Amino acid sequence: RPESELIRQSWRVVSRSPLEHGTVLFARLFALEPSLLPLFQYNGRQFSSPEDSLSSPEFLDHIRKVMLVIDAAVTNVEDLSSLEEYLTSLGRKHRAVGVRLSSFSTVGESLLYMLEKSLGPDFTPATRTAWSRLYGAVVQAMSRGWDG
Ligand code: HEM
Numbered sequence: 001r002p003e004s005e006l007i008r009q010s011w012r013v014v015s016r017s018p019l020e021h022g023t024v025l026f027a028r029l030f031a032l033e034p035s036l037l038p039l040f041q042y043n044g045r046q047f048s049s050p051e052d053s054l055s056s057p058e059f060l061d062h063i064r065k066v067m068l069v070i071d072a073a074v075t076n077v078e079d080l081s082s083l084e085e086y087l088t089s090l091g092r093k094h095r096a097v098g099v100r101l102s103s104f105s106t107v108g109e110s111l112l113y114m115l116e117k118s119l120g121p122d123f124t125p126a127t128r129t130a131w132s133r134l135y136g137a138v139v140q141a142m143s144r145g146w147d148g
Contacts, residue, residue, distance in 0.1 A: 001077075001078065001131065002126075003005070003126070003129075003130035003134075004077045004078055006126060006127050006130045007074055007077050007130050007131065008074060009043065010115060010119055010122070010123070010127050010131070011070075011071070011074045012052060013042070013119065014065070014115065014118050015044055015071060015074075017089050018063075018064060018067035018068075018071075019060060019063055019064060019067070021067070021114055021118060022064065022067045023054065023060075023063060024058075024113070024114045024117060024118070025107075025110045025111055025113070025114040026053065026063055026064075026110070027050065027054075027112040028109075028110040028114065029106060029107060029112045030050040030053070031050070032106050032109065032110065033106045034105060035051065036099075036102055036106075037049075037050065037053065037097050039097060039099055040053060040056070040058075040062070041097075042056060042059070042060055044056040044140060069090070069138075072086075073086075073134060073135075073137075073138050074133035074134075075102075080134075080138070080141065083118055083138075083141060084141045084144075087141035087142045087145075088132045088141060088142065088143065088144040088145045089145060089147055090142055091141070091142035091144060091145020091147035092142060092146070093140070093145070094145070095145055095146045098107075099145045101142075101143055104142065104143075105139075107122075108132070108135045108136070108139065111131070112128060112131060112132065112135075112136055113126075113140075115127070115128075115131060116128075117148060
């Protein structure tokens with residue numbers, strides 16, 4: 001594909017400092033949907049403010065986990081059906097922790113925001129479109145974990 005290379009090339013810049021970049025993604029995420037903050041429950045406690053999450057080693061570990069699943073999608077960009085069962089089960093996990101499937105649309109916007117801000121003029125509309133397709137396929141797979 002042409003899109004496959006556009007994804008690989010755009011990811012390279014970001015994939016080298018995944019915590020820095022996933023930090024932008026999650027900052028944006030809570031700026032858009034602060035009601036996601038309480039779903040990150042470590043040691044029984046609730047983060048009061050978005051900046052509280054950034055001091056949590058467990059939260060930051062989660063950023064790294066997210067960037068690793070995205071990296072798996074990129075690796076597998078030419079065929080994502082091989083991640084389907086992994087992703088379905090990832091979906092069920094998130095259903096279990098209280099995430100509503102609709103919140104994954106905000107996550108997608110947050111990803112696109114992060115890529116836009118890292119790539120600047122290199123985030124062409126074809127790059128956006130390609131990422132939107134890839135993320136969309138990921139969430140389709142995950143959505144099976146919420147009962148189809
Ligand atoms: C609204 C967005 C999200 C919320 C509120 C959320 C919350 C959580 C929570 C509470 C856990 C369990 C605690 C932990 O391991 O940190 C978890 C695990 C995880 N999340 Fe997320 N998450 C979100 C989005 C994502 C996305 C977009 C990905 C990947 C693309 C992701 C990947 C993971 C992985 C890999 C784990 C470990 C799952 C396991 O135990 O096997 N999460 N998430």
